[PDB]
Amino acid sequence: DTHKSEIAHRFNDLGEENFQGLVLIAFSQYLQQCPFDEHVKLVKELTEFAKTCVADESHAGCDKSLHTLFGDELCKVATLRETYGDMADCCEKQEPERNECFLKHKDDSPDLPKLKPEPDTLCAEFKADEKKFWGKYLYEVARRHPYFYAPELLYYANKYNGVFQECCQAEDKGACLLPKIETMREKVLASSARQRLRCASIQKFGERALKAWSVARLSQKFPKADFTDVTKIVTDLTKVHKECCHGDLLECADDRADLAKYICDHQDTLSSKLKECCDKPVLEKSHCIAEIDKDAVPENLPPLTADFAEDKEVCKNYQEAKDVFLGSFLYEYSRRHPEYAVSVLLRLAKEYEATLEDCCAKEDPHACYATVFDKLKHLVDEPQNLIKKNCELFEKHGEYGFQNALIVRYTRKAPQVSTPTLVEISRSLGKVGTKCCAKPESERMPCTEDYLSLILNRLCVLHEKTPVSEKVTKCCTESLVNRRPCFSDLTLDETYVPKPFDGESFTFHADICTLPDTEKQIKKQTALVELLKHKPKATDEQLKTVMENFVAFVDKCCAADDKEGCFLLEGPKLVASTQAALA
Mind giving me the DSSP string for 462-480? HHHHS---HHHHHHHHH-S
CATH of 108-196, one of 3.30.465.10, 3.40.30.10, 1.10.150.110, 1.10.246.10: 1.10.246.10
Residues 6+ apart with CB under 8 A from 234: 211, 214, 215, 218
Residue type, 349: A
Chain CA centroid to CA 375, Å = 31
* Method for this entry: X-ray
**One fold for both 1-107 and 108-196?**
yes
Q: Are 131 and 113 in contact (CB under 8 A)?
A: no
Resolution in A: 1.9
Binding site per annotation, positions for Zn(2+): 67, 246, 248
> Quick one: which of 468, 466, 445, 448 has its CA closest to 456?
448
Question: Where along the chain do its domains lie?
Answer: 1-107, 108-196, 204-295, 296-381, 382-493, 494-571
**Distance from C-alpha of 404 to C-alpha of 547, rounded to nearest angstrom:** 10
CATH of 296-381, one of 1.20.1440.60, 1.10.246.10, 2.60.40.1080, 1.10.760.10: 1.10.246.10
Q: Are 64 and 52 in contact (CB under 8 A)?
A: no
**Distance from C-alpha of 138 to C-alpha of 155, rounded to nearest angstrom:** 10
DSSP string, 106-146: --SS---PPP---HHHHHHHHHH-HHHHHHHHHHHHHHHST
**Distance from C-alpha of 64 to C-alpha of 164, rounded to nearest angstrom:** 39
**Distance from C-alpha of 467 to C-alpha of 477, rounded to nearest angstrom:** 12
Binding site per annotation, positions: 3, 6, 13, 67, 239, 243, 246, 248, 251, 254, 258
SS3 at position 326 = helix
Establish whether the linkage from the previous residue to 96 is cis, with ω within 30° of 0: yes
DSSP string, 445-512: HHHHHHHHHHHHHHHHHHHHHS---HHHHHHHHH-STTHHHHHHH----TT-------SSSS---GGG
CATH of 204-295, one of 3.40.50.1240, 1.10.3720.10, 3.40.30.10, 1.10.246.10: 1.10.246.10
Q: Which CA distances in Å does 217 have to 187, 321, 476? A: 19, 22, 22
For the four alpha carbons of 548, 553, 554 and 555, in that order, the dihedral sign comes to: positive
**Distance from C-alpha of 476 to C-alpha of 490, rounded to nearest angstrom:** 12
Binding site per annotation, positions for (4Z,15Z)-bilirubin IXalpha: 239
Binding site per annotation, positions for Ca(2+): 6, 13, 243, 248, 251, 254, 258
CATH of 494-571, one of 3.30.70.3270, 2.40.110.10, 1.10.246.10, 3.90.120.10: 1.10.246.10
Q: Are 39 and 27 in contact (CB under 8 A)?
A: yes
CATH number of 382-493: 1.10.246.10
**Distance from C-alpha of 473 to C-alpha of 54, rounded to nearest angstrom:** 49
- What's the chain's length in residues? 583
Binding site per annotation, positions for Cu cation: 3
**Distance from C-alpha of 455 to C-alpha of 193, rounded to nearest angstrom:** 8
Architecture of the domain spanning 1-107: Orthogonal Bundle (1.10)
